[PDB]
Structure formats: structure tokens, C-alpha cells
Design a protein around this ligand. Structure first.
Ligand code: ATP
Ligand code: CL
Ligand code: CL
Ligand code: MG
Ligand code: NA
Length: 378
């Protein structure tokens, strides 16, 4: 039986398996090759993944997301106390550990972060089992390089709770490097830069690889910079467009804003491969249809400062590693947001025209590498 590799993301998770000489990134029941790290509780059922995120009658208080921001932290951790202010779900204190509190089947319940993340991992396990046609019992799971012992432990515990023997916890950037076969180099140092822009976070990592041994030389980035921030620029843009056109403010109608935000995420993805996108929402506010469009160039303007801000952390990482641009051997794109053409241009220009490694869907590279390493360890 094959073991699986799982990228347990802040916003999207991905599962792959190595068999018959090659990695298969496994699509879920809706055909999506990555799955939202969402769990929802209703009066009748628990929903995970696409079903949780896509609720037609979504209940903000009982739909949990961002558990990765809590996992392995103390309740009194200032990161937790800050993050709590912007979530619609309740976080409580159980002996200086955080728990997320919800209503389920009519009663108030609370769950540790590693419990919420185990539900996401169970979904990923099941996605794999459907494809393989047998039970999966071993996995490699990835984490950010900056994770500490407590965060790594809680992640491993989420795996155990989901019925997985965790062969190893490995760093996300190391997994992306493995996906591209960069661990296979002989003796002699090669410097690799991983540029990772996901849904919620931005991670720059510089790795030295020598005869298959990885050293983390430098890390930089921003834990509150990702695709969702580009979403929010589009939402604010269209809220102003609706005001102009209909003389109505929709900003305080939570439902209209969620429905607009979903459509902005869909348009954004489309703008990575087309130069314009149409956005059409039936009865968005007080029965008014909102049918409009957005160009790639306009989307770029709306986000220009955010896109540009990704480069100073690259500069910083290089200084910390005591390396010049020219001394990086390989540049690897990771994270869904690096599909954005403008982001690719900025990083390529900064590196004076160097090739980017982008042949593996960037939001799949970490799971791909995890799957490769899981097979080695078996
Ligand atoms: N083609 C695309 N163009 C632009 N953005 C995209 C595209 N495909 C996915 N995204 C965006 O990528 C983001 C998710 O990326 P990813 O799957 O790397 O998340 P992740 O692994 O959870 O990372 P993090 O923990 O940083 O959120 C979302 O904001 C999503 O809209
Ligand atoms: Cl599914
Ligand atoms: Cl479900
Ligand atoms: Mg990540
Ligand atoms: Na992911």
C-alpha cells in the first residue's frame, strides 16, 4: 500500500501519491485538485472542504477556517489574541490552550485546532482512498519552516487523530525542492530560493542542498499577505462600482459581500490566463443584478503595491544568507498566487531574466514533494 503526501494549507490543502513511477495529484469529488481547509457545523451535519466553503446558506459563526494560525499555540500567544479580532467564529480558553467554539446539532461544542485540522486531513485521506481503492495508513505531512516544536507536534497529532501514521513532518519549502528533483544533486552546494505566495501567507526560503542534505539558510516573508488580500482589493473596487451605478451601499450586508467575494476569487483566477473576466451575479442586493467585467491590467493596478511588496523580503533573505542574486542556482514558484503573470514578471525581472521553475502547478508542488518523500521512506 502506498503512503500519501499532504500539504495542509492555511487556506487550501492538497494530496498526492507516488505510484507507477510518477506522482498523482488527486482530484476531489468535485474535480478540484486542491480543497479548502474549511469545516462547518449545522443543525444536522458536519461539512468539510468544498461543501463547507460553498454553503448556499453559510453561517459565519459556525464555519471554521484558518486553524493553522492557532495550531500548537497557547491561548495567551499574541498572535492568537490578534488573529481572534478578525474571525467571525468564537475562540475560548481551556487551560491556556485555544479551542474553537460552535453550535452543532443544537448544542454548543468546542474543538482544539488539531481536532479541526484532523477533519481536513480525514477529507484528504478519503480523497486519496477513493482514487486508490484501498485504505491509507501512512503519510508525510508538511509544515512551514518557521513552525516550532509545539506547532509540529500539534500537526502530527492532527494526523494521528485522522488515523494516519505520520512517517515524517517536513518543511514546505524542502518538499517543493524535492518535487523538482533538486535533492538528487551530488556533492557540491546549490542554493535554491523558494518563493511561496498562497491564500493567506508569503514565505521566502533560501535552502542550500549538498549531496541530498538540506540546510535552511534564510527565511523571510509576511504571514498576512496572500491571495485573499488581492480578493479584498477586488471586493472594495466593486462595492464602489455598485454605489456609483445604483446609488446603494452593499458593504454592511454580509451576504452580498460574501457572494461578491466568491465571484471576485473566480474572476481573479480567470485573469491569470485571460486578459479580462466577466463578473455576473443575479440579485446581489435588494434584487439588483450585478453584471460587469474586470481587465487584467485593472486588477494589476488595484494590487500593484501588494505585488511589489513581495520583493523586499527576497532582498532580506539574500542578505541573511550572505548571497548575491547571481549565486542562486534555482528559483521555484510555490503557492496559487504565483500563477498571477504580474507576480512572475516582478520576480523574474528582480532576478535579471532568470528562468522560473513553474512546470508543476505551484499550489501542488508541496504535496507533490511530500508524496515523493513518502514513497522513499516506505
Ligand atoms: N490561477 C490562479 N491565479 C491567481 N490566484 C490563484 C489561482 N489559483 C489559485 N489561486 C489562489 O491561490 C490561493 C491559495 O493558494 P494555495 O493553494 O497555495 O494555499 P495554501 O497552501 O493554503 O497557502 P497559505 O497557507 O499561504 O494560504 C487562493 O488565494 C486562490 O484564489
Ligand atoms: Cl471532496
Ligand atoms: Cl463533506
Ligand atoms: Mg504553505
Ligand atoms: Na496548499
Amino acid at each position: 500500500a502506498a503512503a500519501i503526501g499532504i500539504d495542509l494549507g492555511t487556506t487550501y490543502s492538497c494530496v498526492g501519491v507516488f505510484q507507477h513511477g510518477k506522482v498523482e495529484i488527486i482530484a476531489n469529488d468535485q474535480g478540484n485538485r486542491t480543497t479548502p481547509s474549511y469545516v462547518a457545523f449545522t443543525d444536522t451535519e458536519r461539512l468539510i472542504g468544498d461543501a463547507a466553503k460553498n454553503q448556499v446558506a453559510l453561517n459565519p459563526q459556525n464555519t471554521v477556517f484558518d486553524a493553522k494560525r492557532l495550531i500548537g499555540r497557547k491561548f495567551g500567544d499574541p498572535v492568537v489574541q490578534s488573529d481572534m479580532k478578525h474571525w467571525p467564529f468564537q475562540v475560548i480558553n481551556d487551560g491556556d490552550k485555544p479551542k474553537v467554539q460552535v453550535s452543532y446539532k443544537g448544542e454548543t461544542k468546542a474543538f482544539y485546532p488539531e481536532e479541526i485540522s484532523s477533519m481536513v486531513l480525514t477529507k484528504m485521506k478519503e480523497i486519496a482512498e477513493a482514487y486508490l481503492g484501498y485504505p491509507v495508513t501512512n503519510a508525510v505531512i508538511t509544515v512551514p519552516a518557521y513552525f516550532n516544536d509545539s506547532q509540529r507536534q500539534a500537526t502530527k497529532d492532527a494526523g494521528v487523530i485522522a488515523g494516519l501514521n505520520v512517517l515524517r513532518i517536513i518543511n514546505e519549502p524542502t518538499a517543493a525542492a524535492i518535487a523538482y528533483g533538486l535533492d538528487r544533486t551530488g556533492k557540491g552546494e546549490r542554493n535554491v530560493l523558494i518563493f511561496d505566495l498562497g491564500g493567506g501567507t508569503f514565505d521566502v526560503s533560501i535552502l542550500t542542498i549538498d549531496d541530498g542534505i538540506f540546510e535552511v539558510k534564510a527565511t523571510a516573508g509576511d504571514t498576512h499577505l496572500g491571495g485573499e488580500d488581492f480578493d479584498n482589493r477586488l471586493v472594495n473596487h466593486f462595492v464602489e462600482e455598485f454605489k456609483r451605478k445604483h446609488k446603494k451601499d452593499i458593504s454592511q450586508n454580509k451576504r452580498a459581500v460574501r457572494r461578491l467575494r466568491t465571484a471576485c476569487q473566480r474572476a481573479k483566477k480567470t485573469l491569470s490566463s485571460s486578459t479580462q473576466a466577466s463578473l455576473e451575479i443575479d440579485s446581489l442586493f435588494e434584487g439588483i443584478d450585478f453584471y460587469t467585467s474586470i481587465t487584467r491590467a485593472r486588477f494589476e493596478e488595484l494590487c500593484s503595491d501588494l505585488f511589489r511588496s513581495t520583493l523586499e523580503p527576497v532582498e532580506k533573505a539574500l542578505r541573511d544568507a550572505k548571497l548575491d542574486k547571481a549565486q542562486i542556482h534555482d528559483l521555484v514558484l510555490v503557492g496559487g498566487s504565483t500563477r498571477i503573470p504580474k507576480v512572475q514578471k516582478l520576480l523574474q525581472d528582480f532576478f535579471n531574466g532568470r528562468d522560473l521553475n513553474k512546470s508543476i502547478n505551484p499550489d501542488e508542488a508541496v504535496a507533490y514533494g511530500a508524496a515523493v518523500q513518502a514513497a522513499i521512506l516506505m
